Structures are given as structure tokens and as C-alpha cells.
Amino acid sequence: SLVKLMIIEGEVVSGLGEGRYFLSLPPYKEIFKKILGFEPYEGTLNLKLDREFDINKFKYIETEDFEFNGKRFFGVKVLPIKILIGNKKIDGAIVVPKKTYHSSEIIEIIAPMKLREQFNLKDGDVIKILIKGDKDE
Amino acid sequence: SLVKLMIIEGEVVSGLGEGRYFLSLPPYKEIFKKILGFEPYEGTLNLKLDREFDINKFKYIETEDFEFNGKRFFGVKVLPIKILIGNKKIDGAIVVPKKTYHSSEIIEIIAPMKLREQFNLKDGDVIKILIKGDKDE
Ligand SMILES: Nc1ccn([C@@H]2O[C@H](COP(=O)(O)OP(=O)(O)O)[C@@H](O)[C@H]2O)c(=O)n1
Ligand SMILES: Nc1ccn([C@@H]2O[C@H](COP(=O)(O)OP(=O)(O)O)[C@@H](O)[C@H]2O)c(=O)n1
Ligand code: NA
Ligand code: NA
Known part of the structure; x- marks a missing residue:
């Protein structure tokens, strides 16, 4: 078998507080918990x-x-x-x-954690995300 | 930036000694050394x-x-x-x-080593190979 991985660098940036709003809604909280x-x-x-x-x-x-x-x-x-x-x-x-x-x-x-607090992340810091698989795997 | 990786399992199998022949030829030895x-x-x-x-x-x-x-x-x-x-x-x-x-x-x-001897590999043993990038990266 084979596994595909993609690792992408991202620079920490700020919105205007949209996500703290949407992620406070119980239907989003509950469905994310179920999926993830x-x-x-x-x-x-x-x-x-x-x-x-x-x-x-x-x-x-x-x-x-x-x-x-x-x-x-x-x-x-x-x-x-x-x-x-x-x-x-x-x-x-x-x-x-x-x-x-x-x-x-x-x-x-x-x-599942506040990443900024756990890792002392400020705007401009760079982190990575890893994705496994793609639409054809 | 992003990095793509592919990891593929392969089962150790045997040829009829073709590669020991071709890899003994100095032009192949020398060009592989230069490239790799x-x-x-x-x-x-x-x-x-x-x-x-x-x-x-x-x-x-x-x-x-x-x-x-x-x-x-x-x-x-x-x-x-x-x-x-x-x-x-x-x-x-x-x-x-x-x-x-x-x-x-x-x-x-x-x-650069005989993998069978270094790792005691027999026909049927499974190992992995990793490829970084693809034709569009
Ligand atoms: N898992 C998470 C989610 C949000 N955050 C941060 O938590 C704060 C509140 O999230 P938010 O969705 O309102 O983001 P902003 O629009 O404030 O950038 C922001 O500073 C996010 O960067 C975090 O550090 N880790
Ligand atoms: N780097 C390498 C190259 C070949 N080999 C093994 O070394 C032996 C001689 O290589 P070969 O190219 O003649 O392969 P066969 O056709 O004998 O399978 C074979 O047993 C290969 O499996 C190895 O263990 N590690
Ligand atoms: Na946000
Ligand atoms: Na061979």
C-alpha cells in the first residue's frame, strides 16, 4: 500500500474574532467533536x-x-x-x-487547545500542518 | 512552502541476477555516483x-x-x-x-550497501521507500 503526506508551512495571522463566535455555537461544537x-x-x-x-x-x-x-x-x-x-x-x-x-x-x-497559549504563538510565527491522503486515496 | 511525501510498501523479491551485472559496469557506477x-x-x-x-x-x-x-x-x-x-x-x-x-x-x-546483508532481508520481507516531491514540485 502507499500513504501520501503533504506538509505546508503557515504564518500565524489574526482575524477579527469570527472563529471564537462560530466555535461557541453548540451545533458546531458537537458536530466537530463527532467527526474529529x-x-x-x-x-x-x-x-x-x-x-x-x-x-x-x-x-x-x-x-x-x-x-x-x-x-x-x-x-x-x-x-x-x-x-x-x-x-x-x-x-x-x-x-x-x-x-x-x-x-x-x-x-x-x-x-483541542489554544495553540497561541500552549506554544506562545504571535502573529508572524510559522508553524506546519500535515495532511494525509487526498481525494483519490 | 509545501513538501509532498509518498511512502510505498514493497515486498522483497528476486530477479535472475541482472542488476549485479549492469551495476558492475563502470559507466553506470560512475554516473549513479555523480547524480546521487x-x-x-x-x-x-x-x-x-x-x-x-x-x-x-x-x-x-x-x-x-x-x-x-x-x-x-x-x-x-x-x-x-x-x-x-x-x-x-x-x-x-x-x-x-x-x-x-x-x-x-x-x-x-x-x-550504498547490500541491504539484504545489512538488514537480513529475505524474499517476502516488506520494507518501505519514501519519495519527496513529484513532477509538479
Ligand atoms: N485552537 C486555537 C484556536 C484559536 N486560537 C487563537 O484563539 C484566539 C481566538 O480565536 P478566533 O477564532 O476568534 O481568531 P481571531 O479572529 O481572533 O484571529 C485567536 O487569537 C486565535 O488565533 C488558538 O490559539 N488556538
Ligand atoms: N543495494 C542492494 C542491491 C542488491 N541487493 C541484493 O543483492 C543481490 C544482487 O543483486 P541483483 O541486482 O543481482 O538482484 P537479483 O536479480 O539477484 O535479485 C540480490 O540478492 C539483491 O536483492 C541488496 O541487498 N542491496
Ligand atoms: Na480565527
Ligand atoms: Na536486482
Whole structure:
């Protein structure tokens, strides 16, 4: 058999607090836990890559639309990854809205810990993510 | 930036002594040394994979035809790899004739040591090879 791996460097960047909002919603929390087998920290780590990232080149899991506290929320595409910081690894996932006007060089990742606090990460620090497999594996 | 890796399991198999012949020829010995930066053991380790291997999907190096002791020999396609046996790694390369009637599930690898003796490998033992990059990287 064979295994394909891709390791991508990403530069830590900041959003405007969107992910701490969305990741506070129980339907997203609960579905991420079911898919990924961990309870995500409430937030997303934004990473700036040097090429656009297209989740459709991989075997992602898609979640469903839902309504919560009266507002409509849309499903997301989720791709399990490993996060590599120095010699440590952390289970995580790339999360992308299910509909986007184009693929971005900015990705958002979820993990079971606050990565900035655990690893003292500041904007500009570079870390790596590892993806196993692709859409044809 | 990103790095792509592919790790493929191969089962140790035997040829009929072809590679010890070809790898004894000084033009092949010398060109492999120049390309790869190691002096190959005189022989090739044959490995049986569970899918066909196509060297043309990777960034291989092609050698030139030559004449030696009066006979014509043809250039080969060479792809640097790591050989993984347990927790050890060895620099090596996949070598394929430059013209073949089709891609095979059997590959031949060269290395700077006799792998069978160094690692006590018998027909049927399984090892791994690692390839970094592909034709578009
Ligand atoms: N697993 C995570 C998730 C978010 N974060 C960080 O936690 C904070 C809150 O997440 P957020 O989704 O609101 O991100 P920003 O839009 O604030 O960059 C930000 O500083 C993220 O970079 C983290 O360090 N580890
Ligand atoms: N780097 C290498 C090259 C060949 N070999 C083995 O060395 C012997 C001689 O190589 P060969 O190219 O004549 O292969 P066969 O056709 O004998 O299988 C064979 O037993 C190969 O499996 C090795 O263990 N390590
Ligand atoms: Na975020
Ligand atoms: Na051989």
C-alpha cells in the first residue's frame, strides 16, 4: 500500500474574532467533536500560506446547515490534519465554509487547545500542518 | 512552502541476477555516483508493490546511452529516494530503463550497501521507500 503526506508551512495571522463566535455555537461544537473525536478550543487559528488552499483536492467531511437562537447557519467542509509545532504534534482540522466565492491562501484551523497559549504563538510565527491522503486515496 | 511525501510498501523479491551485472559496469557506477552522491552496491534490490509504479509522475534524472566492452547500453531514469527499514533510513534510488513497453509493479532500487546483508532481508520481507516531491514540485 502507499500513504501520501503533504506538509505546508503557515504564518500565524489574526482575524477579527469570527472563529471564537462560530466555535461557541453548540451545533458546531458537537458536530466537530463527532467527526474529529476531539472537543475544539472555541476559536480558529488563522494561517497564511504561500499558495491558495483548495479543500476540494482532499477527502473532507461536510456538515449540515442548521438554525440556532433564531438565525440560519451553513454547513462547513472539515479536513482532519496534524499540527506540527517544533517536535510536538496536535490533532486538528482545517475548516472552510461549504460555499466560497474562491479558494484562499488563508486557512482556519481548529484544535483541542489554544495553540497561541500552549506554544506562545504571535502573529508572524510559522508553524506546519500535515495532511494525509487526498481525494483519490 | 509545501513538501509532498509518498511512502510505498514493497515486498522483497528476486530477479535472475541482472542488476549485479549492469551495476558492475563502470559507466553506470560512475554516473549513479555523480547524480546521487553515493557509490551504489553492485546490484539492485527488486521490490514488488501492490500498484504499478510510473516514474514519469516524478522528477527523475535521465542518463545517457553508452558503449562498453563493445556492446551498446541504454540510459536509465533515476529517482532519488529514502529506503525505510524499521527505524533506519538509507539513501537510495529507483532505477528504470528509459524505454519500457509498460509500467511495472516491480521496481529496482540501488543503495550504498547490500541491504539484504545489512538488514537480513529475505524474499517476502516488506520494507518501505519514501519519495519527496513529484513532477509538479
Ligand atoms: N485552537 C486555537 C484556536 C484559536 N486560537 C487563537 O484563539 C484566539 C481566538 O480565536 P478566533 O477564532 O476568534 O481568531 P481571531 O479572529 O481572533 O484571529 C485567536 O487569537 C486565535 O488565533 C488558538 O490559539 N488556538
Ligand atoms: N543495494 C542492494 C542491491 C542488491 N541487493 C541484493 O543483492 C543481490 C544482487 O543483486 P541483483 O541486482 O543481482 O538482484 P537479483 O536479480 O539477484 O535479485 C540480490 O540478492 C539483491 O536483492 C541488496 O541487498 N542491496
Ligand atoms: Na480565527
Ligand atoms: Na536486482
